[PDB]
Design a protein around this ligand. Structure first.
Ligand SMILES: Nc1ncnc2c1ncn2[C@@H]1O[C@H](COP(=O)(O)OP(=O)(O)OP(=O)(O)O)[C@@H](O)[C@H]1O
Ligand SMILES: Nc1ncnc2c1ncn2[C@@H]1O[C@H](COP(=O)(O)OP(=O)(O)O)[C@@H](O)[C@H]1O
Ligand SMILES: Nc1ncnc2c1ncn2[C@@H]1O[C@H](COP(=O)(O)OP(=O)(O)O)[C@@H](O)[C@H]1O
Ligand SMILES: [Mg+2]
Ligand SMILES: [Mg+2]
Ligand SMILES: [Mg+2]
Lengths: 7, 371, 364, 370, 7, 7
């Protein structure tokens, strides 16, 4: 979630 | 009784009849299996998926490429793809039509003979011949000599020929292809912050690679410009809608092909191996090979690849020796065009290896009647 | 005048000095400000859910508390090293170095990789290390005191994910802990009553046929709950990411493919030396289960059913009681080793000029 | 007042003292350099490795052979190898030890000049000299007449000699010793399924061919009986623990040696060039050479090469001429034994190339004295 | 990886 | 290759 895209 | 052909490359199967200027089936070569069990009744819920269906509903199906680096790995998936190609896209029964195949050089004789055996014992084909994915590109170009460099999604090889006489001792092959490039792209994106680890995300990264990725002459100068200014930062949207920005990675990716030291491999680049191969031949034919070298297959549609290769080969070779690259726009289907031309030719008919020959001599015949 | 050690982790944080076998202090990074061991009610943040950082201001508050309350030093020049995942985005370490060089001097830090840190800690020069933290895990090979940097592997399923799956299982059973609290109690019960299944089918048959394996655990409020198959199931959700919702091969197959991607002449030296690090690796029955899984995967992929030469494999996994602080011990050893020369570090100077680019001196 | 010898082969190198009957320090002539930049600090890492160290730890180091087909191309690596073999394996100062070198018959005069200049300047030795591997391989057996066929790692050749007088108009040279052989073995293994492209894989293939492959007599009959009967398929283990089977490659490799057409050349086999060299010679020495024909070199250790060689040479040669090919054991060290014998001979001392001659007439003196 | 040995 | 011309 905190990868600016995926996860 | 018109013949057909089906180039089953590691990226996508190109299948089409002969005597045509372009193929019909251009469909991706992937097999998807549902991650979950599924409970719906009467609405699809098939136990497998192949072709564009996988790429469409990829967010759930775990994907698998049956063939890797040109060698087959899952014969069941391969024959499933062949069935889907022959009975759904082409809508034809191979029992009344031959089937020309394609394969990369220096591949397992076991793999080739197993392919022939399954094609003969499962589809009841009347004849079945194989060939290289480079002489076909040469035929499509319409020449009779020169060196040919293919960079398919699975492999990357180069082969010289002069007046139709090949030179096996000069052939060169490497396992570098678009998959390693996509892996390196995912790694450098994670370095940026964007994470891509699944198969659908791998396909998205491959689409990004096909869309925006180039090369340059001065890699160090490009790196300096990208680190100083932001004129190279390009944007791309995703199905979710959250746009993203990418910088020097677009051109840092192919540096793996031009510098395998990035990914870890120790072999040299395409320019060095091409120079070595050319040097393995005789000078009287090197003089011409330098003057006409053709590119084919995917992984070479990048913009500017011609200038980089030209500069590299010119710096590696003497100056007085003129050099000219041949990179037309119709390269992704050059092997198919060559296969169609060869199937439409007349003499090639006598070379077709039929069913009775295989039945009486076994698969070992393929290693003699063919290249 | 010796440097300090600080391996800022996902949910925990351990600190000591340049030379100390056991960490002097360790406390959860949970969060006037309550940052520190005061957690024993204000807001709960848990900033570092993974190797990434989100609330950099709360992280700064936590570091201030650690340096002023747990520690009594506020220097500018005293070297202090750090830790981070292998492929942690550059922005995280950039912001970390920026804050630690602006709010404080700390001339010279030289952040490093928990893999090679734990490797130093064990006092080795070759082998593969599999760190299993709370929010992320990674795998790093090494041969003859050399790093590959191209076969390193990351995997974002461990700790927190297994805890969430255990919560979902207890919900399926009926017991619910929807409150933000009780997360620590579930973590405690997990680390207390959990173990990998050497034979998954055997454990399933046992749980389905016998009343044993069912335990009764108390809670701080006073009530009691019952735990069953979840005990031996959560290590499976760790082993089977598809169960959690991620598309990955797992752990044993992951390390197997990572090693096979290397050169044959190294493979052996990797099967003979395998170390672990992180509290998540302390699940009972994990090492032998992983060894058996590796043996089966080899038997399947390579020999295809030829057990005539399987005994000639010579796999030797490694485990110790100090994997909980292997990264800390390695950081301390490396700090004590490099405390002499300041060139290898990144002094407070040469920062405004090309500080960010100086951070590229570590990873080419 | 003693001596010293150092045979520098394309693949290997063997150095030591004279007088003895066997070499002292033999090791591969290679240089390994680390490719994976970035190492764990504190433990320390060297810049380059040589000798058995590289072959022991090579999964991370890329290897380079400073010699190709008998010619030198990396003078820095050659100097490093000389330093390693003169200071570590022997631990002897060469300033008070006259050394001896070796070199294929036909090689660049510039290469020989650079070799002698290096040995004279960068080592400050009292004297030195060069020779031909053929003459030393012959001195090993002691016989003075006949023809000698040498085949090292990257270069091979044949040379006749009669009563000490050599026939330079009959010497023959070729570049098929073990390198194109290893390349063709890699190619056939890829054809079988196993891939070998790196340098460590190249050393693995070198070892597997040294241990398993062997030449045959009837190539076609052997290929037929191998394709029909699976009695020749032999297994070999790898450092990791795997096992790989090999069949007709063991015949195809020596067959490639005999038929360069498989490699892409037009030259003829060793037998044809040997018969041609003997033909250019007079008739009496032709007869005297048909009897005493010796084979040496590491490549010569293929089981069953003498019988096949004599069969071919007899089939292509006239009758009434007994052809007794000879190939004694420990022949790959025959060059070293010949060099040691030559250095031990008192007369040969007068032929030493001292330092005054080099300082006066430069390195070109090597030619006049040779 | 899919060469029954190396790669 | 190392003959300054051919090979
Ligand atoms: N005795 C135990 N048994 C099993 N698991 C445990 C035990 N003790 C702690 N854990 C687990 O370990 C996790 C804490 O890991 P820790 O914070 O030490 O990793 P880390 O060193 O911070 O990793 P990173 O440096 O990558 O962030 C907790 O979430 C908890 O579930
Ligand atoms: N426009 C493009 N730009 C860059 N790369 C491309 C482009 N189109 C295709 N590719 C690459 O080419 C590969 C397809 O290879 P392909 O030519 O189909 O191999 P084969 O000839 O074996 O079928 C894909 O993996 C993709 O990454
Ligand atoms: N027992 C053996 N069987 C087959 N080949 C061998 C054997 N021993 C050595 N060789 C080959 O011989 C080569 C060594 O050549 P060598 O005789 O040292 O050349 P030089 O005479 O120039 O030193 C090696 O490359 C190796 O492949
Ligand atoms: Mg292709
Ligand atoms: Mg950790
Ligand atoms: Mg030799």
């Amino acid at each position: 979630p905190a990868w600016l895209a995926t996860c | 009784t018109t013949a057909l052909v089906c180039d089953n490359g590691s990226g996508l199967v190109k299948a089409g009849f002969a005597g045509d200027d372009a193929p019909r089936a251009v469909f991706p070569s992937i097999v998807g299996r549902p991650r979950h069990q599924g409970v719906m009744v009467g609405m699809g819920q098939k136990d497998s998926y192949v072709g564009d269906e996988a790429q469409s509903k990829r967010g759930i199906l775990t994907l698998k490429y049956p063939i890797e680096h040109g060698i087959i790995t899952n014969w069941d998936d391969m024959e499933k793809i062949w069935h889907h190609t022959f009975y759904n896209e082409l809508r034809v029964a191979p029992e009344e039509h031959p089937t020309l195949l394609t394969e990369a050089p220096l591949n397992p004789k076991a793999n080739r003979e197993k392919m022939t055996q399954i094609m003969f014992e499962t589809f009841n084909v009347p004849a079945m011949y194989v060939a290289i994915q480079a002489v076909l590109s040469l035929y499509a170009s319409g020449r009779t000599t020169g060196i040919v460099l293919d960079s398919g999604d699975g492999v990357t090889h180069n082969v010289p020929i002069y007046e139709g006489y090949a030179l096996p001792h000069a052939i060169m092959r490497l396992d570098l292809a678009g998959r390693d490039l996509t892996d390196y792209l995912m790694k450098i994106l994670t370095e940026r912050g964007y994470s891509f680890v699944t198969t659908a995300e791998r396909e998205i990264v491959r689409d990004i690679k096909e869309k925006l990725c180039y090369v340059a002459l001065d890699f160090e100068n490009e790196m300096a410009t990208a680190a100083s200014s932001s004129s190279l930062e390009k944007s791309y949207e995703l199905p979710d809608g959250q746009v993203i920005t990418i910088g020097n990675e677009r051109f840092r990716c192919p540096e793996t092909l031009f510098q395998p030291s990035f990914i870890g491999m120790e072999s040299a680049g395409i320019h060095e191996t091409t120079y070595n191969s050319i040097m393995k031949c005789d000078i009287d034919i090197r003089k011409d090979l330098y003057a006409n070298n053709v590119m084919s297959g995917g992984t070479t549609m990048y913009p500017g690849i011609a200038d980089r290769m030209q500069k590299e080969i010119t710096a590696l070779a003497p100056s007085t020796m003129k050099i000219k690259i041949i990179a037309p726009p119709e390269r992704k289907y050059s092997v198919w065009i060559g296969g169609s031309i060869l199937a439409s030719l007349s003499t090639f008919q006598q070379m077709w290896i039929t069913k009775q020959e295989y039945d009486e001599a076994g698969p070992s015949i393929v290693h003699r009647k063919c290249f | 005048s010796a440097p300090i050690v600080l391996d800022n982790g996902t949910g925990f944080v351990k600190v000591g000095y340049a030379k100390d076998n056991f960490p002097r202090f360790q406390f959860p990074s949970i969060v006037d400000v309550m940052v520190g061991d005061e957690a024993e009610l204000l807001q709960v943040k848990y900033p570092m859910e993974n190797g990434i950082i989100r609330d950099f201001e709360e992280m700064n508050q936590l570091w201030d508390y650690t340096f002023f309350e747990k520690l009594k030093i506020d220097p500018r020049g005293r070297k202090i090293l750090l830790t981070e995942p292998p492929m942690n985005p550059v922005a995280n370490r950039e912001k970390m170095c920026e804050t630690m060089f602006e709010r404080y001097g700390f001339g010279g830090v030289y952040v490093a990789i928990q893999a090679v840190l734990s490797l130093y800690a064990q006092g080795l020069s070759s082998g593969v290390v599999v760190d299993s933290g709370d929010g992320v895990t990674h795998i790093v090979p090494v041969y003859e005191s050399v790093v590959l940097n191209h076969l390193v592997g990351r995997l974002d399923v461990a700790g927190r994910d297994a805890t969430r799956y255990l919560i979902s299982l207890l919900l399926r059973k009926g017991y619910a802990f929807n409150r933000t609290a009780d997360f620590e109690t579930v973590r405690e019960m997990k680390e207390k009553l959990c173990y990998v299944s050497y034979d998954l089918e055997l454990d399933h048959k046992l749980s389905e046929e016998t009343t044993v394996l069912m335990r009764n655990y108390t809670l701080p409020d006073g009530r009691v709950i019952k735990v069953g198959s979840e005990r031996y199931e959560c290590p499976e959700c760790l082993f089977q990411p598809h169960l959690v919702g991620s598309e990955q091969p797992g752990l044993s197959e992951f390390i197997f493919d990572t090693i096979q991607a290397a050169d044959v002449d190294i493979r052996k030296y990797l099967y003979r030396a395998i170390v672990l690090s992180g509290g998540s690796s302390m699940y009972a029955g994990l090492p032998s289960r992983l060894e058996k899984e590796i043996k089966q995967l080899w038997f399947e992929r390579v020999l295809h059913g030829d057990p005539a030469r399987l005994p000639n494999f010579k796999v030797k996994i490694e485990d110790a009681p100090r994997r909980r602080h292997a990264v800390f011990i390695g950081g301390a050893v490396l700090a004590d080793i490099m405390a002499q020369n300041d060139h290898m570090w990144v002094s407070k100077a040469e920062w405004e000029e090309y500080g960010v680019r100086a951070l590229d001196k570590l990873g080419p």
